[PDB]
Symmetry: C6
Subunit: 223 residues, 6 copies
């Protein structure tokens, strides 16, 4: 539908652009939260990968724990050659894994250098465990700075319960424009993966949980 | 004199539930989890005052920028920038302990300058979170409510909560120092979401009880029979 | 020399449940979540005492202003300003400008002597308590004992955050009080149901469990169970 | 098979549930939420001792005044003031006038026990003093030494404690039951808007007792327990 | 393959497939009045009466006098055994290593093979400290070659095995005594949660406490 | 190269559930409440490596003494003493003298690895030194460094940790699963008055696996898992 207020870019992730009514809001950050092994990193990568392959939009991936080499190695599970894209200057993996102000400028520099339209930030809450009010302000500053740059950003966060707080510090969903929840629910000894778009400021979207699978082709969502 | 009188919100179904609207000269707490429609409720309250009654409004925002408020309001067919240019709406940027005492006098300037009868305060929780102490939150919120009452503004103020059926708000005190409490819920059941609105209390006047289903549409909040 | 006597509240249904009303000379805790009717109960207690028995009352407010108290009471067709003007009611403002327990108690005593009040309602003492469970326990204990010396029959409101959880905020209030009333506002299947319970009345009898009630244009009405 | 001796409470039903009454020369913890009948159990225990057996009793109170104890007991037609005048009952007042010392309190209790030649003791409100210790470890050791001292005097003691949940911890600090020889739990269970009073003997060291909850009522005659 | 010693507690040796592993520590955890002390006592008493294996009982809160008096209700004369030198009740009711040394001395002096440690949880006021202290105690008893029953407390029937959430991880063997409320009735059950290096029956088995001690029915 | 390759555990049913075994050169976290079979899984991993593929193994123990490990494995008919005597299995006692330095341990581990030419490593009881810290942030960082150091040596590692609830957090500090590449959960669930053991592979980074819980028993031949 054209009659929505916020311009969106397509993830080209199957089923997600339907649920989000067109993709992710351009120039804004989308929180992607979930328990362990829910597919947060995969979503973040597939966002960048599809952007490059489909639209030749350069991407910057910021990682806080997983090494660039593990990211590249793990992506081969889906037939994606990220090293080749890194070689072409179409993908840049920014290694922030051994101050958030200095980091923001590193990202800013990479975005300008590589002319990136899409940004994924994976594992930023590992920097918080280092108070909810402090988390809230720092995230708020990061989101605002990314917006001023004009980046369209996916940022992952962690949660420890399938049905409970959106993320660890109970403030993350409130300073984000957009919130996506990945679940991996255990019921009667079986797991089922779901994705929910909890909110998208300024636009409609499908509500509730929608089933998805992770396969050799990445994330497949069925709305 | 009379029992407290009410101001019509013109939000479909709400004036029915509230038996006339929001109590005049007082603040109404509107609490909910993330993306429940709190900002929308606050905006629609002001927007309807301007369009339907030519009552000017002041919107106070703590985190969301004025430009984003305006842009997001276009989703509901509302041209806030036009209202700002006509001087019928003023958006006060409260983004950066935080001095709520200094803030309220800036709000007063705007109220007097634009002759506002309706005020919406969105995101005061972000300030309360610095406090991170129930006793301080209670005291500061009490003073804020008291100062607003002195001005005579009819006010909607939003707050956050983290559970659909737990505490009214974050610090377990907000509902006790508010005259009026509205709870917006976004309940997940069987993988589907169901939005509801409840008027928990209105001091000194009557209202319908329990939860009432609503949806958010291209025309804003729509509360069902 | 004999069993504790009771003072009638004239609150529709309560004197039945309480088997005569509130125990004379003692304080009754009325606890509830937000908007359960705690202030209304406290006010109706004084209002009925004035109107039915010509017993003067003192209302102590810690947050809500006297003006608001009066304004909100007009919802029930009650003219509190009149009762204040006639010297039958005093609203004692202990609320802060937009804590000394001893100073407050002497003000209450002064007011009780000045207006010859037999009934007292204290609304919002919780707000000063939040400024340690055992500090709260000791302060509350002292307030109760002091009111007892004066001979006041007192309604005292407190807050709770769950319908089926602790009686009040600090887990000690009910153990210090002689009498405990719980107001509930239970949400079940998107519908709210108000109930009143007399949990405890020291040295006397009372009906048990929850009894449904409503708040109407003329105050609290309590009905038979179920 | 040498049995632990017991003394009868004469509280209707209880001596059946306890198989003879309360273990002699030991302390029995009586825990419950608000208005569960803890003080009533404490008083009825002393009152029956005096009336039925001519055994003097000492009631130790920490919050409720002797005058209120006496006043409230008239609800059941008991004249405690008369018993105090006869020296059959002594209400020891430890209530505050508007870190306390145990050793002072116990020597008071000890003196009162010796003076009135009391065989039964009820201690009511000791939780109030364990509440700004407000530390489980501290409460445990202080309560332990209190029990040990009472045992030396040879007093058979009922001591009340508080709990804030019907089916949660035995008492406030999760330690009180572990340092008591005997534990009784009074419950006031709310189910479907109705209340149900129950008494349970959770444990009696070294002796037998009936298990689980038994319904009781409080009437003009005090506590009446049913099977 | 692992040698076990018989508790001779009715039904228990069946549940443990032959008794408690010799030279190992067994945690016996439960809420108040679940039969922890009774289990500890029977373990030593049976070892003495039937196998002439001396025992040491270590008590932290309950006095030796009360332990003796309470055991008498089961017809067990512990005073005779302590006077015969077959049993030693170590009053640890006045520094864990000072305790350890006293235990060791008693074991050596009385040539004890069974040890019951009852109420060690009262020593603690930090889970890491508790874990470290308990591990040292267990390790030392193992080096001595003692077979040990060690009681601990819990506050809920279903939840943490013991108070500090570490006790079950430092013990070789874990036994849980439950006293579960089912519609106003109590039901006693015993469960062996783990026995390192050997098999055992799984889950809960009902028992009663009678004039002859613990009576477990594994059927 | 391509997708991450896997090393066969030869544990009955597990290689089916993991679609080929444990990811080579990486650590797999194995979490469970008390007596769930974590040490057994760790031992059986090394034992099968030695017997089936002649791949030497190193077992790092933080609590159980080496002799207890050997003695406890005898109920499964595994002669671990012989394997130690042959130099095929090295048990590394990492218990502190009856707070901890990871880099010192990695050296001892690395040395043992080179010396015994070990393909497989099991680390059992590292949670005990994590409690010394009692801070999720500290635990998270320390574990992260352990995983990275182990990766640098190229060891395929089983790493046990603890939890106190069958259906609560994966491990103690709520961070362990997030810095691990691979996560296995052993459960021991009450069914009426009976117990039911289950194994779940929660995640394996960069590769596939079966989902949910699968029942297993512990017998005289160790762990036997039942898919289908
Ligand atoms: N080829 C594949 N086929 C099927 N499932 C796969 C495949 N490759 C990976 N997966 C799944 O994808 C998961 C990894 O997803 P991730 O995106 O790394 O999750 P994550 O939320 O980032 O978890 P973390 O970062 O480790 S907490 C694995 O646990 C597998 O379940
Ligand atoms: N045109 C529309 N049609 C339907 N739903 C819409 C439309 N526009 C917005 N929404 C919904 O409105 C939500 C946002 O409403 P808000 O009032 O901003 O909620 P909120 O409680 O203020 O959330 P915060 O401040 O981000 S925590 C979005 O998440 C959408 O679900
Ligand atoms: N005329 C009326 N008819 C029906 N209900 C009314 C009327 N006037 C007020 N009420 C109700 O009474 C409630 C207020 O009762 P209060 O006694 O003020 O409760 P409260 O427990 O003191 O709440 P606090 O102090 O604000 S937390 C309102 O929320 C209404 O639901
Ligand atoms: N004559 C009576 N008939 C029936 N019930 C009575 C009578 N007298 C008192 N009661 C009940 O007994 C209760 C008081 O029992 P108590 O022994 O004081 O309880 P409690 O556990 O000591 O409460 P505390 O100390 O205030 S927390 C009252 O709440 C009544 O429900
Ligand atoms: N002769 C007996 N006949 C029947 N049951 C008995 C007998 N003696 C004791 N009991 C029961 O056994 C319980 C005491 O068992 P213990 O082993 O002392 O419990 P415990 O777990 O050690 O509790 P603690 O140490 O007080 S927390 C009593 O509460 C009775 O229920
Ligand atoms: N021969 C056997 N037959 C059946 N079950 C056995 C046998 N040998 C051991 N077991 C079981 O294996 C369990 C021990 O498994 P472990 O791997 O040691 O568990 P664990 O998770 O390491 O527990 P910890 O470290 O003590 S908390 C015992 O509790 C028994 O239930
Ligand atoms: Cl999947
Ligand atoms: Cl909607
Ligand atoms: Cl009503
Ligand atoms: Cl009753
Ligand atoms: Cl039994
Ligand atoms: Cl098994
Ligand atoms: Mg990831
Ligand atoms: Mg908003
Ligand atoms: Mg009120
Ligand atoms: Mg009492
Ligand atoms: Mg014991
Ligand atoms: Mg192990």
């Amino acid at each position: 539908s054209e009659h929505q207020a916020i311009a969106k870019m397509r993830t080209m992730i199957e089923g997600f652009d339907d649920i989000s009514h067109g993709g992710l809001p351009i120039g804004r950050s989308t929180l992607v939260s979930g328990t362990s092994g829910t597919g947060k990193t995969l979503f973040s990568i597939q966002f960048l990968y599809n952007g490059i392959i489909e639209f030749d939009e350069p991407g910057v991936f910021v990682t806080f724990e997983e090494t660039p080499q593990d990211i590249i190695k793990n992506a081969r599970s889906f037939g994606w050659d990220l090293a080749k894209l890194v070689d072409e200057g179409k993908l840049f993996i920014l290694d922030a894994s051994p101050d958030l102000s200095a980091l923001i400028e590193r990202i800013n520099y990479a975005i300008q250098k590589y002319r990136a339209r899409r940004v994924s930030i994976d594992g930023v809450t590992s920097v918080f465990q280092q108070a909810s009010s402090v988390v809230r302000r720092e995230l708020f500053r990061l989101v605002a700075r990314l917006k001023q740059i004009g980046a369209t950003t996916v940022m992952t966060t962690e949660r420890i319960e399938e049905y409970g707080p959106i993320a660890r510090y109970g403030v993350e969903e409130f300073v984000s424009d957009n919130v996506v929840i990945l679940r991996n629910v255990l019921e009667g000894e079986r797991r089922r993966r779901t994705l929910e778009i909890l909110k998208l400021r300024g636009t409609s979207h499908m509500k509730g949980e929608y089933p998805f699978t992770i396969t050799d082709h990445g994330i497949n969502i069925f709305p």
